[PDB]
Amino acid sequence: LEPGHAADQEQAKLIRSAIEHTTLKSVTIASEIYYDPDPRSTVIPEDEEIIQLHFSQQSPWLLRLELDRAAMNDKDLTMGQVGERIKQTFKNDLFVIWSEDNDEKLIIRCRVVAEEDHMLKKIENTMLENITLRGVENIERVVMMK
Amino acid sequence: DLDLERSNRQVWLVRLPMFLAEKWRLGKIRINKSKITLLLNEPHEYDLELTKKVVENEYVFTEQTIPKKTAIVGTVCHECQVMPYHKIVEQRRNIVKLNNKERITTLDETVGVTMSHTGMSMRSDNSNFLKV
Amino acid sequence: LPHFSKDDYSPESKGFVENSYLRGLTPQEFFFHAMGGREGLIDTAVKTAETGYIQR
Amino acid sequence: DGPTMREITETIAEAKKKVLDVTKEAQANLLTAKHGMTLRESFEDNVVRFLNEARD
Amino acid sequence: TTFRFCRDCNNMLYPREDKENNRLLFECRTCSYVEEAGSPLVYRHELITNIGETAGVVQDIGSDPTLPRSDRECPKCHSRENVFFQSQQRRKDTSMVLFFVCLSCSHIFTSDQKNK
Amino acid sequence: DESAPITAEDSWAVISAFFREKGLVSQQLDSFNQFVDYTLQDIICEDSTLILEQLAQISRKYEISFGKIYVT
Amino acid sequence: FDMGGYFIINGSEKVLIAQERSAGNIVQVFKKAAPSPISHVAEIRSALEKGSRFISTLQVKLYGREGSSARTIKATLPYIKQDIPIVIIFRALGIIPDGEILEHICYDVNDWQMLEMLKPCVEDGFVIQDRETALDFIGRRGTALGIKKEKRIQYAKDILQKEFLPHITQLEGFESRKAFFLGYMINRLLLCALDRKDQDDRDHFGKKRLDLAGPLLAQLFKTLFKKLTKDIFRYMQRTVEEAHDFNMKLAINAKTITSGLKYALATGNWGSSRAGVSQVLNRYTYSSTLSHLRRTNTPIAKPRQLHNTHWGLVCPAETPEGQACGLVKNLSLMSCISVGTDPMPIITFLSEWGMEPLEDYVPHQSPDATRVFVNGVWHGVHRNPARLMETLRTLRRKGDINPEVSMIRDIREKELKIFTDAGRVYRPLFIVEDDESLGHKELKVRKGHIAKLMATEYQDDVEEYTWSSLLNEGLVEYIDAEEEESILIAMQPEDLEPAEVDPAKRIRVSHHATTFTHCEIHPSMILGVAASIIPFPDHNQSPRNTYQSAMGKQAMGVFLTN
Amino acid sequence: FIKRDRMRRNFLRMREYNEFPLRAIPKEDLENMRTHLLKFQSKKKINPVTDFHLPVRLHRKRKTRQLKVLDENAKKLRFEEFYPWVMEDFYNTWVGSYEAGNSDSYVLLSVEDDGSFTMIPADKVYKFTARNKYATLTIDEAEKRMDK
Ligand SMILES: [Zn+2]
Ligand SMILES: [Zn+2]
């Protein structure tokens, strides 16, 4: 590190959070696909809260996934900046919603403009593997040493 | 000209033990109303288990591209299995585990006789084989 | 070894030799010590076999 | 000497109590491993460290 | 995920979108057998797998001499005679949390004091 | 008594009763003896039959088969 | 004092060193850490028990790395070039529906993961849905010498009835059985892919088979006998074709067998395939001959390192140094090699107690049925392995079944392997019984049997009480390295069996374990011949025991009296 | 602490019901007809032959001096009869195959009008499979369609 910012742990945590590779699959507990034809209304009774907030022609098929809050902590992340990353990845073809940090259950939902399931499953592979949330390539397990 | 005779006949399939089956290659069944046995002729009595109660899609036919004479017998009604002085049968089952083969026999002669029969022994022909 | 229980993480069963060469060793310790000896011999042999090629 | 043999027996015994305590805390899932290793690696490092410390 | 099979065909029922009534259906592409949908769920990946740790539990698990014995009592029947073993899921990040198997009611109660 | 547990030294006797029966090199003798006893008859009997097919114009055949082998 | 156990060729004492090879007819799975598209390989070397010596090996490959989707399964077949999916083979075996295929592969409907990974194979199996189109598919894929299709469909069916899985049998109609076994191999491959089972270890000594003079002379005499028959028939065809007289002296030659056996037992080669089998007997001393005849060789995980399965079977100290270190092994003092028996009476005896055949098996009607395996062949299941196992063990201890047969009952795997093949290395151990009149566990052998035994020993009035009398009464049992996985052995009898100190004695373990099934005769028997001469090897480091075990094969002494 | 080698001197100094009879049908009917078994593979529970409709039909569909290999009897007789039979109408199709292994011991207890039974030894056993339910195929069309 630099001689000016020496003997500092928080700065080294920022540098580690700036170079250590992170991916979307790292934070992902599980994902699941739903058939929900109406774009706005959702059959799922829980996510209705999200439906109430994050809203205020598209695919009938829903892609949904859940993240580990502990992963959101150990690897510092924001549901917002994640949704930003995906939105600036696929651009406008895939509509995106993500749950709040306040939610005790982290939820992310996405849709598109044969069966829609296969298309979604392709997008699943792209999401898990081909998205890097932060950090430069080929860097892992940065260890602090005095 | 295949013709179904009846198929209404009900047949029971039985998985017998080997000595009685090879013996069959007559008794009296006693149906006890859910436990049934068999009183053979002098000799043992045998409880036959209701192996499979429902036994559909199984039938029995007989035979008297090459079409042949085909006749249909009856439907299979119940899958069964005969279950078994039992100490003698257990001893016979232990006794079947004693099969062996004969070992190689060592010729004990004076060798010179056999070794004389090996090579040239001034004895030819004596057997017609590939003699043209 | 088939002389201990399953899922045993005790140090004695995992290779710790608490006895000394003055009072002898137990079989389950002499076996592991034999493994370490054979491993030492093999390691020395490989280190020499590669040391020669490096030397050339 | 005798007292030295008893001091060695107690030295090893204290390390055995430490490995048993870390073993119970590991079986109770009450020990979180540090960054870079897993629970089993840190546990083996602690046990091996205690055994080598008692032997030294 | 827990899909059904066709009748007579016994083939897997691929999901078919119903655009007329706008509702999910299950079809067989070999035949014309299409049944309704009792759930919108179709696919679940479940990345982080935690099942399989307690695999291979049999009714005759109490007669295993190789397995150890403990004296901790069961929370249900309060029987101190039980047999414990760790998780059956073999993986690097698998915790060493013990699994207690009572020899009376056959209940599987663990020893984790953090999460139960 | 006769139903008393054995000791550690007593086990040595058992080992004696082992080496009196087997011997230090009994595996080669047992394997070789079993080879001579059964393996010869098995190899001879597993592929002894060979036939020659002779044609004439009436068909004809010849056969040679090996039976019980004899060792000296 | 001449121990014998060797041959004499041209006045030279030749010794046939015990060869070591791997076993067959066992499903194995391995991982591939290479960038190859195959992630796991399910190898199984299939071969008959006697005759022909089959080398064909079936392989079930799993394509697609972890993380990526569309992970199909494709298994190779002999004489067929490209690989064929498993479901298409299931169509070629007579099973058309896919629910029955998933019913044969996965035996648990509650598990969704294996069935989930089966989906792509059910898709390609949807592409080809007919049995006749599958037989024509395998007929068109491999072996193009049939030319005609009508002969390549029946020829492919004959391949599936004969060359496909040489073990079990080779008759027509056994396609259901082989379908269940194939679904079992797929269940082991996918079950290994779900990280529920570790990679199959090849260093386990129980999965290894040794070869003495028996198997070697079986291969040699087999090939020489085949050549003899072929030559005799050649003389027959020459005789009938050239139209002459026949003679028994010109048809059957003796220099083929004499030159074959004399040449193979004379030279190091066993026909380069195999070399170094026959070595001159080392007569430097008596322990050099004892340790020389018991010497076992291993042809070229790390095989040189000492494995934990070598306890009581291979000497942990007696090993040479140099290039052949750890590849040469020595038999421990009470270790023997099996000779092989007959599995037919056992298979015949199992079906008399309700052992359901394999072709009648339904996993939905009997999910808790225990599978029975005889030499790797799956003959059927049984819904009561407790009483059956107790019966086979009681009849195994009485002397009916040959004690060389090793039977294992894997509880978690829910299997019961039976090994009666030649080549396994076993060792005798005592039998421990828990039900006694004292209230605790105690050995089966008592003091009266020891008194009669020593009476016969020192008497040689006699009582004819020897080792065989100790074995037939159920007091001592042989255990290989496979059964050793399912037993608990005790070291000292009077130190670990009863239930509860001078500082000069060594510290030992405790007796918290109660389910001791067997007990070690004596630990000092784990050493070989050369290490047995060492005085107090416990108080000495291991490499010195190895160096002394190496110097004990060249010291001056008196080998014999003649 | 020493090896006790004087054990020779120590050992030398120390030493309501219903009964119904069974009968065997005369062997003439066994010489006239051979009894085989039927087992279906369509999962459907019912499937009787009355619901199979009519007309039910079950029918089976120069060199010098050289060398021959050999072969035995029963296996040859079973090898020459490599034509499986089929039952159809004029449509449902059922094609059976041999079972072989389920020979062993199988005795039939045919129930007549009276309470007694007639026992007949089973010759063989066959597994019938309902064929051509969907009605489709292709051969070369599937070989070219599988190359995508
Ligand atoms: Zn269908
Ligand atoms: Zn309980």
From Swiss-Prot, chain B:
It comes from the Eukaryota. It is found in: Nucleus. TFIIF is a general transcription initiation factor that binds to RNA polymerase II. Its functions include the recruitment of RNA polymerase II to the promoter bound DNA-TBP-TFIIB complex, decreasing the affinity of RNA polymerase II for non-specific DNA, allowing for the subsequent recruitment of TFIIE and TFIIH, and facilitating RNA polymerase II elongation. Present with 520 molecules/cell in log phase SD medium. Belongs to the TFIIF beta subunit family. TFIIF is composed of three different subunits: TFG1/RAP74, TFG2/RAP30 and TAF14. This is Transcription initiation factor IIF subunit beta. The lineage of its organism: Eukaryota, Fungi, Dikarya, Ascomycota, Saccharomycotina. The gene is TFG2.
Swiss-Prot record, chain D:
It is found in: Nucleus. The tandem 7 residues repeats in the C-terminal domain (CTD) can be highly phosphorylated. The phosphorylation activates Pol II. Phosphorylation occurs mainly at residues 'Ser-2' and 'Ser-5' of the heptapeptide repeat. The phosphorylated form of Pol II appears to carry, on average, one phosphate per repeat. The phosphorylation state is believed to result from the balanced action of site-specific CTD kinases and phosphatases, and a 'CTD code' that specifies the position of Pol II within the transcription cycle has been proposed. There is a cross-link at residue 24 (Glycyl lysine isopeptide (Lys-Gly) (interchain with G-Cter in ubiquitin)). Signal peptide: none annotated. Component of the RNA polymerase II (Pol II) complex consisting of 12 subunits. Interacts with DEF1; the interaction is direct and serves to bridge RPB1 to the Elongin complex in a DNA-damaged dependent manner. Interacts with the Elongin subunit ELA1. Interacts with the Elongin subunit ELC1. Interacts with ASK10. Interacts with ESS1. Interacts with RTT103. Interacts with SHE2. The C-terminal domain (CTD) serves as a platform for assembly of factors that regulate transcription initiation, elongation, termination and mRNA processing. Belongs to the RNA polymerase beta' chain family. This is DNA-directed RNA polymerase II subunit RPB1. It comes from Saccharomyces cerevisiae (strain ATCC 204508 / S288c) (Baker's yeast). The gene is RPO21.
UniProtKB/Swiss-Prot annotation, chain F:
It comes from the Eukaryota. It is found in: Nucleus. Coiled coil: none annotated. Component of the RNA polymerase II (Pol II) complex consisting of 12 subunits. The binding of ribonucleoside triphosphate to the RNA polymerase II transcribing complex probably involves a two-step mechanism. The initial binding seems to occur at the entry (E) site and involves a magnesium ion coordinated by three conserved aspartate residues of the two largest RNA Pol II subunits. DNA-dependent RNA polymerase catalyzes the transcription of DNA into RNA using the four ribonucleoside triphosphates as substrates. Second largest component of RNA polymerases II which synthesizes mRNA precursors and many functional non-coding RNAs. Proposed to contribute to the polymerase catalytic activity and forms the polymerase active center together with the largest subunit. Pol II is the central component of the basal RNA polymerase II transcription machinery. Belongs to the RNA polymerase beta chain family. This is DNA-directed RNA polymerase II subunit RPB2. It comes from Saccharomyces cerevisiae (strain ATCC 204508 / S288c). The chain holds residues 20 to 98 of 1224 of the full protein.
From Swiss-Prot, chain H:
TFIIF is composed of three different subunits: TFG1/RAP74, TFG2/RAP30 and TAF14. This is Transcription initiation factor IIF subunit alpha. It is found in: Nucleus. Present with 1920 molecules/cell in log phase SD medium. Transmembrane segments: none annotated. TFIIF is a general transcription initiation factor that binds to RNA polymerase II. Its functions include the recruitment of RNA polymerase II to the promoter bound DNA-TBP-TFIIB complex, decreasing the affinity of RNA polymerase II for non-specific DNA, allowing for the subsequent recruitment of TFIIE and TFIIH, and facilitating RNA polymerase II elongation. Phosphorylated on Ser and other residues by TAF1 and casein kinase II-like kinases. Belongs to the TFIIF alpha subunit family.
